[PDB]
Amino acid sequence: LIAAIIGEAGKGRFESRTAVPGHVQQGKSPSSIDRVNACRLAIKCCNFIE
Amino acid sequence: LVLIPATISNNVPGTEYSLGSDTCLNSFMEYCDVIKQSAAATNRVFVV
Amino acid sequence: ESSRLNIAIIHVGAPTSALNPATRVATLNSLAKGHRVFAIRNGFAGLIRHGAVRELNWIDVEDWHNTGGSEIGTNRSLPSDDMGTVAYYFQQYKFDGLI
Amino acid sequence: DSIIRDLERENVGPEFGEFLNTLQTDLNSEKPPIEQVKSQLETHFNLAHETQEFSRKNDNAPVDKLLTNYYNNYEVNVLEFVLQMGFSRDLSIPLNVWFVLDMISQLSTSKQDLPLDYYLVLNNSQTGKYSDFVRYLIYEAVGAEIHLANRGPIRGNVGAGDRKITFHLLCKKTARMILVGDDRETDFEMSDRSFVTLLLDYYQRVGTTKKIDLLLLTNNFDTNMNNKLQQLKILESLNMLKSNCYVLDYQITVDQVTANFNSYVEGIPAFRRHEIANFLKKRKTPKNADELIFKYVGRWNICYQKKFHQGNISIHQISGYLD
Amino acid sequence: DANFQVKHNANLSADERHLRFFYDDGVKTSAVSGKSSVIDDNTSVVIGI
Numbered sequence: 001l002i003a004a005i006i007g008e009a010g011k012g013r014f015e016s017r018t019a020v021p022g023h024v025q026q027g028k029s030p031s032s033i034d035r036v037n038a039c040r041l042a043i044k045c046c047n048f049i050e
Numbered sequence: 051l052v053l054i055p056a057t058i059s060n061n062v063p064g065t066e067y068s069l070g071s072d073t074c075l076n077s078f079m080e081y082c083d084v085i086k087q088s089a090a091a092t093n094r095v096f097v098v
Numbered sequence: 099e100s101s102r103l104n105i106a107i108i109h110v111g112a113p114t115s116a117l118n119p120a121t122r123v124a125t126l127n128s129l130a131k132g133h134r135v136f137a138i139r140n141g142f143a144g145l146i147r148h149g150a151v152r153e154l155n156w157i158d159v160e161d162w163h164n165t166g167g168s169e170i171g172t173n174r175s176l177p178s179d180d181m182g183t184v185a186y187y188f189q190q191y192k193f194d195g196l197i
Numbered sequence: 198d199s200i201i202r203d204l205e206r207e208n209v210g211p212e213f214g215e216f217l218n219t220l221q222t223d224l225n226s227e228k229p230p231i232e233q234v235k236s237q238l239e240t241h242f243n244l245a246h247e248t249q250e251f252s253r254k255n256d257n258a259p260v261d262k263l264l265t266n267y268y269n270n271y272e273v274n275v276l277e278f279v280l281q282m283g284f285s286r287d288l289s290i291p292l293n294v295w296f297v298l299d300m301i302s303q304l305s306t307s308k309q310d311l312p313l314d315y316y317l318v319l320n321n322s323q324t325g326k327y328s329d330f331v332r333y334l335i336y337e338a339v340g341a342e343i344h345l346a347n348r349g350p351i352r353g354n355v356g357a358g359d360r361k362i363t364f365h366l367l368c369k370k371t372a373r374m375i376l377v378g379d380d381r382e383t384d385f386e387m388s389d390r391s392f393v394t395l396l397l398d399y400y401q402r403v404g405t406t407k408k409i410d411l412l413l414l415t416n417n418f419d420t421n422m423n424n425k426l427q428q429l430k431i432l433e434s435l436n437m438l439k440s441n442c443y444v445l446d447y448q449i450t451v452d453q454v455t456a457n458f459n460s461y462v463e464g465i466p467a468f469r470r471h472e473i474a475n476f477l478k479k480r481k482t483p484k485n486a487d488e489l490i491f492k493y494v495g496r497w498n499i500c501y502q503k504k505f506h507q508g509n510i511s512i513h514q515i516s517g518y519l520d
Numbered sequence: 521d522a523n524f525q526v527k528h529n530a531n532l533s534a535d536e537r538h539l540r541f542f543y544d545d546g547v548k549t550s551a552v553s554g555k556s557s558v559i560d561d562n563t564s565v566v567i568g569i
Contacts, residue, residue: 023088023096024081028166030115035163038116042123042197049195050103050133084166091113091167147543149535186539274529277554309528311554406545 102131103194107154108138108145111174115166122162124197125154136191140171146183151191200329207326213290216241217330222337231305231338231355235298238334242291251288254449256508260296263445264303264411267505267512274307274358278439280409281317282428283417284324287449293324294331298338300413301364305356312361314407318396319368320389321418328368335364348374367396375399389422394489397435408439414446416454426458430473430495440515444501447510455509462501462513469497524563526551 006016030038055062058074085096105128109117125135135154144150152170162169177184201214220237222230239245252260259266264273281300284293297317304313319325336345339353339362348371355362372395373383412432417423425446432438446458461472473495481491498519505512526537532551536542540551541558550558 024084026084026088026113026166027115028080028084028087029164030119030166034116035119038120039123042120043127045197046105046124046127049105049197050128050131087167088113091117091172149533183539187535190535271529275531307529308522311527311530406547408545 099132102133104134104136104192106136106138106151106188106191106193106196107170108141108196109168109170109172110141110176111172113167113172117168117172118162118165121170122159125159126156129154129156136193137170141173141175142177142179142184143173143175144171145187146175146180149187151187200333203329204326209326212242213327213330217333220334220337222340224340224342229302229355229357229359230340231298231302234334234338235295235302238291238295238298242289244289244292244295247289247292248295251292251449255510258507258510260447260510261299262303263447263510263512264300265306270307273304274310274360276304276411276443277311277313278407278409279304279313279315279411279413280432281315281413283318283320283415283423285415285448286323286418287416290324290327290330294327294334297331298334301338301362302356304411305358305360305362307358307360310358310360312363313355314363314365316365316367319366320392320423322389323418325368325370328366328370332366335366339364348379367399372396389419390488393422393431397489400435400437408442409437410439410442412438412442412444414444416448416450416452420454425454426461427490429458429462431489431493433496433499434493438515440518442515443504444513444515445511446513449509451509459511461495463503466497466500466519469495473497524552524560527554 003016003018006014009016053062053064054069055065055067056069058068058070060066060068060071062068082098085098089096107121107124109121121137128135137152137154138145139150139152140148150171198217201217204214205211216238219241220234222233224230226233239248248260252258279300281297284290288296301313301315317331319328319331332345332351335351336353339351339355341351341353343353345351351364351366353362354360369387369392370383372392373385373387376395377383409432412429414425414429416425429444438444444462446455448455461469464472477491477494485491499515500517500519501513502516503511503513526532526540530542530551532542536551542549542551547556548558549556550560553560
């Protein structure tokens with residue numbers, strides 16, 4: 001609806017388009033921040049339960 | 051007057067290769083890989 | 099030997115690329131101490147419906163620091179689906195800890 | 198008794214109505230009811246020559262113990278969902294019936310079985326009329342003195358192992374009854390084609406999500422519609438068979454359908470894919486288009502593996518799904 | 521009674537035979553009755569005169 005309202009705005013001034021990355025949001029490879037933290041926290045999990 | 055076909059679609063007759071179709075193919079291929087990988091993580095299909 | 103335990107790892111929820119690297123470090127940390135690492139494949143539903151437990155070793159962990167999604171499977175199913183069955187399996191595999 | 202009038206009315210010989218009088222199970226006796234009725238069928242109808250011949254003309258195959266021999270006790274007794282896709286045009290109605298009971302007895306040797314579901318489909322007009330004869334036969338065979346009906350499944354115990362069975366008989370009389378909400382006036386035409394699509398209409402509206410693990414195939418009358426290969430092809434498309442479903446094809450006569458059939462079942466994936474494609478190209482007309490065969494076309498990617506073959510009788514099992 | 525006991529001619533795992541149920545094609549089936557309803561109320565009985 002937001003995209004539809006933008007389109008009709010300015011008596012058809014600009015071309016509005018929707019984009020839905022969606023399930024691609026998970027990514028192909030984890031970032032370095034993710035890799036570094038996954039390691040810190042996994043270590044802390046094991047230290048706790050064990 | 052010379053035309054060098056340039057479309058991600060490859061709808062122009064005269065060529066079997068339009069400029070930008072490999073760029074496009076590769077970006078969509080990278081997108082589909084991530085989607086299939088996600089399907090592989092969960093008995094699920096994706097309509098792309 | 100007396101202090102060695104059976105550790106369970108489960109992936110509950112939608113996929114993230116961070117799952118395999120986290121599971122890798124947790125498996126190595128645990129194996130280093132002599133504990134046995136068991137991966138509950140395909141969340142609680144996998145456990146309940148198929149008893150989908152897989153033992154992990156130093157070699158199994160290979161290439162996981164780079165890989166996205168889940169190698170064991172991730173889903174939003176809950177133990178609620180059948181506690182009794184979850185409890186039966188926890189007792190069978192004698193889990194002494196869970197991540 | 199009412200059946201005896203129905204039979205005379207359907208041009209059927211009195212023999213049948215006469216059998217239903219001399220037909221009675223001893224119950225208390227060591228011999229299981231299915232086996233009693235079975236032996237009574239052989240006597241009244243003299244099915245000794247024809248059975249022997251059915252073996253003889255099929256390279257002396259054991260037409261009495263087709264299942265029993267091939268499979269071990271576990272394998273035969275694990276089968277729970279069975280579809281019998283008609284009656285052979287090569288055997289008499291009493292031999293065909295007998296064989297139903299005989300195949301049934303074969304899967305019920307054990308006392309360590311989960312329930313059995315057996316579906317008999319009597320597709321053409323030739324056999325269709327004997328539904329009630331078969332129903333009174335299966336009723337006595339199982340001994341449904343547990344708790345017959347105009348419609349519906351016959352439930353009881355069966356064989357050497359008293360294995361709970363539920364025998365389902367799909368024919369046009371039951372299909373008409375259904376369509377007219379059980380009205381007295383069920384006298385209207387119904388083509389074998391219509392009948393196949395209504396059987397499906399029922400599977401999808403009844404909800405059934407159980408897989409057939411033994412598929413009995415033969416040469417039925419009305420091959421234009423009741424074509425062996427075409428029935429298999431359909432079941433493959435609708436995802437109705439178990440991933441290790443057994444496909445038994447029995448008969449005496451060898452024709453082109455049997456060649457077409459065997460070349461498909463035993464064909465390489467490339468052969469099957471073309472088999473399908475060229476049929477569609479050669480046989481599909483804009484008038485033909487709607488027929489079920491044009492929709493539920495088979496799947497080349499289903500692999501089979503030969504298990505048994507004694508001249509004209511064979512067992513193939515689904516061995517994989519390429520994807 | 522064998523009727524109330526797990527059936528031996530079935531593709532059953534040791535845990536499936538202990539749980540007395542198995543998941544067939546999604547459907548939770550009783551490893552005894554073959555029925556969808558896993559719990560039979562007739563199995564817990566008072567034996568009297």
